[PDB]
Amino acid sequence: MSEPRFVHLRVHSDYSMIDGLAKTAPLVKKAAALGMPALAITDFTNLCGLVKFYGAGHGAGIKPIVGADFNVQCDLLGDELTHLTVLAANNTGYQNLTLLISKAYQRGYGAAGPIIDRDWLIELNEGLILLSGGRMGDVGRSLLRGNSALVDECVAFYEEHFPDRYFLELIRTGRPDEESYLHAAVELAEARGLPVVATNDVRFIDSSDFDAHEIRVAIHDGFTLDDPKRPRNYSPQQYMRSEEEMCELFADIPEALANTVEIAKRCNVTVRLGEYFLPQFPTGDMSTEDYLVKRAKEGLEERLAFLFPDEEERLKRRPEYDERLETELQVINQMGFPGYFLIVMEFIQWSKDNGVPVGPGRGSGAGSLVAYALKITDLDPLEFDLLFERFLNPERVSMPDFDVDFCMEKRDQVIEHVADMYGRDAVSQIITFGTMAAKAVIRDVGRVLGHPYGFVDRISKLIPPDPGMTLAKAFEAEPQLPEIYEADEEVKALIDMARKLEGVTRNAGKHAGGVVIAPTKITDFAPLYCDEEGKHPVTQFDKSDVEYAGLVKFDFLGLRTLTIINWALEMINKRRAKNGEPPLDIAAIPLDDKKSFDMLQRSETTAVFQLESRGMKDLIKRLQPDCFEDMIALVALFRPGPLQSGMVDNFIDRKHGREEISYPDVQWQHESLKPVLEPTYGIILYQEQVMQIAQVLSGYTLGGADMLRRAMGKKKPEEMAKQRSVFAEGAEKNGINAELAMKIFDLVEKFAGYGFNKSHSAAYALVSYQTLWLKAHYPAEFMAAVMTADMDNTEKVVGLVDECWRMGLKILPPDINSGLYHFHVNDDGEIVYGIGAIKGVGEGPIEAIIEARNKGGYFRELFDLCARTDTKKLNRRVLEKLIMSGAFDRLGPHRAALMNSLGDALKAAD
């Protein structure tokens, strides 16, 4: 009748971490290949892959069933931990399950892992369906004892707290006591009026995956495969059995199969994706809408007076901006996003007031004039043909994302601000996952297969260093890989296994990935993960997943460029009182400064953000970038595709009169494209040019244009066919020839494949320009801040003193009486060496040197230095390392005679 006869209600993904092999989407695609309509994933004490589950479910037509597996702990069975599955039947249940999981982690745990108390199920109860745990459950273990009274006590709990919502779970996977328990559970179930359910307790996709999952478990547990003492809790039968295979396994208990279909139908959880659940912003008695309109119009007034400080020009130039402003404002308010813009502007402001550097990145946010008006971004988008619809497209369901990051060192300062702002409980850090990439998986599998370190490292050293590296990429890039694979049985067995485990989730990361902001308690939105002491709580959804589930987040990034600008500006602005000049606003600098572009065309881009590569210096030389547009272009030009397709040469040639500019091609061009293609010498370089060509040539809206760029990325059969038609009749309607329109469409689509995000490139290029302008106008304080930042890399600071020399700057060698922790700039414009860069010293010892010398400089020699201070902060190892950096070369003798003095005078301290 209804027709499907089985669904899997207990399945682990690799997100269980203790076990599992298959990722979330692959498990969903298996279910569907099996012709199943639904699928429970019940990972161990987490919902980490839930957002991925839901996305892959919709894609495959499969209904996701939300659950988790636990180890349970009641006073009846003492210290023995038992298994339970908890399924969320509705959203009440989902939230109860999220609370249950959080509660386990917050309680803390030991080697045994996180555990729930059975009685937590009393209050955390509604909307949950429980499967009994099988032989390894409460009732299963009591049954296997054969203590009738104990069994009755155990089930009684479920009869009271879970009527019609507790199922006795039956599992045939060829494991000890399964059938004996099953026989006794079926007797219990008839005697009590209780229902039975079959599961396959799935840990892998196919039966032939068993050996690889054994290896995965052994890596986690820390055993070698051939160890007799190694836990063998799994069988080869624990794969995703088909409907028929389960139908035959349980042909004797049809209720058990049918109860899977029934439970699957009762379980209907909405996890909504792709829309924000924003926290509330302090708007007074103003609408959120109206408060944003106000701050944006008035922010636009500041920008306009900076850009056009002649009032005659500001009037004539103004309409365009006001129209852009209210056009954006309309999309933001009608989509329900003004709170978002407001939160981000507040955050950007707060981090300026306090000393919290935020990264260059802005998603596609620099194409918003409102972002600019609000001081979220610092570039005029109308000057640079940056497009609002590439950031927030009204014809689309979107989540605007400024992707703002800050340095992880300052997380506590920011968690604090955003708790004061939105509520302490509504604020949380975000989980990261450790996976087994190429080098690691080889190492891990190799050890489990019993190889000594030497054998396996002879393999892993053949995997290239490269950021993205995979085993498949490694085998193509390195010919010795194929060779030893075919020539060595042990290596073949090893790599075949490493291929099955590559990418697999191993653990919660060492550090968090960001700070997330909820409208209420975090637990209203994500479950928590914590350490063994229930500390370091983090959302069980990571960066991408947490935001897809509708939370505002701010990422950690360790990029030190804004820290450098910050420090350099502090140093510049001290030169304030020294000649009573107003502070510098790095945001207020001209973008056509000649000194800046002179220095850049000279390829002098050491310590200039993004532009330090030898390759990039080669490119700058040939290109001779003399405007900011060219700086935006550099990252788009400097790629393997553009260089090995002649586009870089075309761009450079058309720039310097060596090649005629066409819009874009000699034959296949149209003059209406000239304003669009002008800044790039008629080359389609940007994603936004793709969009403007569809708008201008064939009458697309900017939002419909962003939909065509998106369709060009996917490259699907039916997809294009339709846009190809819109684009045809759009050009026809502009009086443009059909064959030309189509031939230009082919070119747009060719170049769209390399097409760079102009707004992403521009936000970064502005930061390059800032480091470039600083270097040109305040070389001493700029290099000083850069050398401070790189202090712990000695190779790197050395290359920076070389650059300083090359610049005509005077960097002074370590001076004990003159030096600070940071490099700084004396009243002469000479760089005073930062003592922090002397390897083997440290902020602790140095603070104690400055603390002494301050209080009455001081010092006149080595004896006088440790005459007071202190061994308990300024010991010998630090002193000898100070001598050899030459820090005492202005007082007494040289390094040699200082080491053998050392001494000796040492003891004259006390």
Curated annotation (Swiss-Prot):
Lineage top rank: taxon: Bacteria
EC main group: transferase
Coarse class of the protein's main subcellular location: cytoplasm
UniProt keyword DNA-binding present: yes
GO molecular function annotations of the record: DNA binding; DNA-directed DNA polymerase activity
Membrane-spanning intervals of the chain: none
Listed EC numbers: 2.7.7.7
Any one of the GO BP annotations: DNA-templated DNA replication
Catalytic activity: DNA(n) + a 2'-deoxyribonucleoside 5'-triphosphate = DNA(n+1) + diphosphate
Function text: DNA polymerase III is a complex, multichain enzyme responsible for most of the replicative synthesis in bacteria. This DNA polymerase also exhibits 3' to 5' exonuclease activity. The alpha chain is the DNA polymerase catalytic subunit. It is tethered to replicating DNA by the beta sliding clamp (dnaN), which confers extremely high processivity to the catalytic subunit, copying a 5.4 kb genome in 11 seconds, a speed of at least 500 nucleotides/second at 30 degrees Celsius.
Protein name: DNA polymerase III subunit alpha
